[PDB]
Amino acid sequence: IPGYTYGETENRAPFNLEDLKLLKEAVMFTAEDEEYIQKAGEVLEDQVEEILDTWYGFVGSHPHLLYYFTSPDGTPNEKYLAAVRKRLSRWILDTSNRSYDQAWLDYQYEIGLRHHRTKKNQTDNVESVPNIGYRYLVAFIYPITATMKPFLARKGHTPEEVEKMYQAWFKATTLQVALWSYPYVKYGDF
Amino acid sequence: IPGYTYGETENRAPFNLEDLKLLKEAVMFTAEDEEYIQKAGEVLEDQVEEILDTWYGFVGSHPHLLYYFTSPDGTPNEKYLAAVRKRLSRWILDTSNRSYDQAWLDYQYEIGLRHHRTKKNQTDNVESVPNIGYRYLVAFIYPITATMKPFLARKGHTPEEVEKMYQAWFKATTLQVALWSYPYVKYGDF
Ligand code: HEM
Ligand code: HEM
Ligand SMILES: [C-]#N
Ligand SMILES: [C-]#N
């Protein structure tokens, strides 16, 4: 998967497993969610193509959001979208199956650097908008979780099991976006 | 309510009703949620005291989080907690009942400035920790929504109505925390 560099990033993340422990606590994330995040990957794995179409149908339906994938002329860079889409598919499975250890944290830093001006448009060698305004990364927590929800039901899991999978996804997504704020936040304020 | 200065803030917010429109869209917030956020205020209004005890029982159960309310000696400033608790009660009702207009946005800027080093500890004239690390404001989206959820059921509303109220709260909370990132984010990166 071109540009997917999990386990081979150049930089150590500025946060460690102790930062991670304390952040999982703020998001109420426990061993029970690790079980259910894993079970969510099992339900979503088959359905990944449809999820990405839904996710991109949301993004592309709003000009101010599709904007972050556009060429300087205001039109979508179809090469950009396609390369990023493959890495997004990976992130679904990584969120479900990786031990959230130092390598995981090193890749979280990297993904944050990629939405931010520090490394946006480098991974795919594209000319696009310089920075994704952070206000939108926070905002996106909600539609990421809403998009996942009907897919988690699709395999006829009970609504309780479904609820627990969704809550795990909500926590794990909130957790990640919080780490990704690092290159956006004033030094010392994170 | 001492220090509650909604409608009398010194500064115009650096974001306007156009920024707000575009952000509500990213969080999927529509006129349907405005109806249900309002109906949520009706269900939660009676229960505010219990909600604040639950919310503070979460915060106080984790040293690294209670930390942000402590005096320099590491012990909780009970005067701080009590003053802030009254303003938090207001925010429950404001989120449910205010038109999200320029005054609302001006107060969002203010609340963000208050968690951030810019104005933390000024409103109550207390000596406490200088800044609340932003990583935790994002993280808190989740426990704010989880704390609200069982209270929204308490009045024997159907689980559908309850679901719609919760989803409105999740969206409105995500929306607010995104605005509050402003004084934390590098200029031009928001
Ligand atoms: C909940 C918040 C978000 C999640 C979970 C998410 C997920 C992801 C993932 C997994 C990647 C690929 C990472 C990799 O390189 O391995 C990516 C990249 C990207 N995303 Fe997001 N994202 C979020 C916020 C946003 C927002 C608000 C936008 C604005 C439309 C956006 C647009 C983009 C763009 C343009 C890239 C490519 C960045 C580059 O040029 O390297 N994302 N996202
Ligand atoms: C979803 C995220 C959060 C929400 C919805 C929220 C809500 C609020 C509200 C409504 C106020 C009073 C605002 C006013 O002055 O009118 C407040 C203040 C305060 N909160 Fe939060 N908050 C969040 C994140 C956090 C975090 C992560 C902490 C860390 C423990 C925290 C601790 C505090 C402190 C210390 C104050 C007083 C700040 C000052 O000295 O002015 N909050 N919060
Ligand atoms: C990112 N989507
Ligand atoms: C703030 N609690």
Residue numbers in the entry:
A (entry chain C), B (entry chain C): 6 to 195
Wording from the paper:
Protoglobin (Pgb) is a recently discovered haem-protein with distinct structural and functional features that make it unique within the globin superfamily. Residues belonging to the Z-helix contribute to formation of the Pgb homodimer, which is centered on the intermolecular four-helix bundle built by the G- and H-helices of the two subunits. Thus, in Pgb the access of diatomic ligands, such as O2, CO, and NO, to the haem is granted by two orthogonal apolar tunnels that reach the haem distal region from entry sites at the B/G and B/E helix interfaces.
The Phe(93)E11Leu mutation does not prevent the insertion of the Trp(60)B9 side chain into the distal site and the stabilization of the haem-Fe(III)-bound cyanide. Thus, the ligand sensing capability of the E11 residue, reflected by Trp(60)B9 conformational changes, does not require specifically a Phe residue. In the Phe(93)E11Leu mutant structure (three MaPgb* chains in the asymmetric unit), however, the haem-Fe(III)-bound cyanide molecule is stabilized only by the H-bond provided by the Nε2 atom of Trp(60)B9 (∼2.8 Å). Indeed, the orientation of the Tyr(61)B10 side chain matches that found in the MaPgb(III)-cyanide structure, but its side chain is slightly shifted away from the center of the haem distal cavity, its OH group being at ∼4 Å from the cyanide N atom. Indeed, inspection of difference Fourier maps reveals the presence of a positive electron density peak (∼3.8 σ) between the Tyr(61)B10 side chain and the haem-bound cyanide in one of three Phe(93)E11Leu mutant molecules present in the crystal asymmetric unit. The only exception is the Phe(93)E11Leu mutant, where two H-bonding interactions are expected from the dissociation kinetics measurements, while only one, to the Nε2 atom of Trp(60)B9, is found in the crystal structure of the cyanide derivative.
